[PDB]
Amino acid sequence: EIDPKDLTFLKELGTGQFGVVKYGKWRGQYDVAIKMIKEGSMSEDEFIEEAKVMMNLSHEKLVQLYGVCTKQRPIFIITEYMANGCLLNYLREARHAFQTQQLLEMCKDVCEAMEYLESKQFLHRDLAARNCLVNDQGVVKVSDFGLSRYVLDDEYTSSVGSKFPVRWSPPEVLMYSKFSSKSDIWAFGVLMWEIYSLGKMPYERFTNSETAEHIAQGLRLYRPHLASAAVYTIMYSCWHEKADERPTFKILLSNILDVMDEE
Numbered sequence: 001e002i003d004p005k006d007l008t009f010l011k012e013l014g015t016g017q018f019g020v021v022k023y024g025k026w027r028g029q030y031d032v033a034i035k036m037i038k039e040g041s042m043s044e045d046e047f048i049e050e051a052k053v054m055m056n057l058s059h060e061k062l063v064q065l066y067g068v069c070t071k072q073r074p075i076f077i078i079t080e081y082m083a084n085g086c087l088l089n090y091l092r093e094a095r096h097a098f099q100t101q102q103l104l105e106m107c108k109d110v111c112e113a114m115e116y117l118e119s120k121q122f123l124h125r126d127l128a129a130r131n132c133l134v135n136d137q138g139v140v141k142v143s144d145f146g147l148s149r150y151v152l153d154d155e156y157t158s159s160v161g162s163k164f165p166v167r168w169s170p171p172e173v174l175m176y177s178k179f180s181s182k183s184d185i186w187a188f189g190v191l192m193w194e195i196y197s198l199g200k201m202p203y204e205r206f207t208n209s210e211t212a213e214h215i216a217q218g219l220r221l222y223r224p225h226l227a228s229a230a231v232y233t234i235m236y237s238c239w240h241e242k243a244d245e246r247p248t249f250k251i252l253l254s255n256i257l258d259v260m261d262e263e
């Protein structure tokens with residue numbers, strides 16, 4: 001529990017699923033981001049109980065939770081500040097002129113954080129470039145993991161809702177709501193594809209409905225021009241029709257390191 005007397009609010013960073021997020025300082029020293037939870041957007045009591053377990057998730061590639069303010073409304077969520085913002089926008093800026101080794105390192109940063117969460121049997125459920133952030137050193141961290149469970153908006157949580165992450169979801173999630181470690185694995189393959197495509201929308205010429213049908217037929221995302229054969233084999237392995245034939249994050253990380261050494 002953070003005392004809100006120790007927070008300042010300096011600039012607006014944008015808006016997400018739970019409303020406005022601000023940059024400010026904690027204890028007159030530490031840069032932070034502060035989610036100000038919009039009334040009616042979150043299942044608040046459930047989140048508060050879960051924030052306890054989340055406080056114990058700690059990894060260099062996960063955005064660090066610093067604390068919450070819950071003796072008031074709106075409630076605040078205080079985290080590590082990531083100066084370069086969301087990975088999606090960052091990939092879309094041509095000025096960065098990324099080398100492919102940089103791209104693979106962003107895939108490795110995310111894979112490390114996911115290997116950690118898999119070790120704790122904790123699902124993200126909304127892994128995508130829009131939900132990863134980039135710090136001042138160009139390190140990618142996984143953000144907002146687990147928070148999908150507390151979203152009250154049915155457009156986001158329903159398989160058929162307009163805001164559901166359809167293009168990041170395996171067939172068994174779309175068809176049967178079968179969520180598992182292997183549905184995060186499938187989303188991670190789509191994230192690798194986003195990175196090597198410099199932020200293109202997955203299935204850029206299809207609707208959500210057409211995407212669902214394309215992947216039910218066994219068809220998949222094409223190899224981005226920047227991806228070697230070996231990089232494409234890694235993201236492709238995440239998309240096996242049988243969830244139990246997809247790798248773990250531990251295996252993917254070994255595969256990524258092998259390609260780094262090779263290429």
Ligand SMILES: CN(C)c1ccc2c(c1)CCN(c1cccc(-c3cc(Nc4ccc(C(=O)N5CCOCC5)cn4)c(=O)n(C)c3)c1CO)C2=O
Pocket residue numbers: 013014015016017018020021033035063079080081082083084085086126130131133143144147148151
């Ligand atoms: C349920 N799920 C999956 C959720 C729920 C809430 C949210 C998200 C998913 C993801 C999006 N989101 C959200 C909304 C608003 C802010 C943040 C958000 C933005 C940050 N940082 C920055 C830094 C700079 C800039 C910036 O404006 N630029 C412009 C020039 O180019 C360089 C950077 C933007 N954000 C940050 O550090 N955190 C921790 C969170 C976040 C991330 O947290 C949410 O709050």
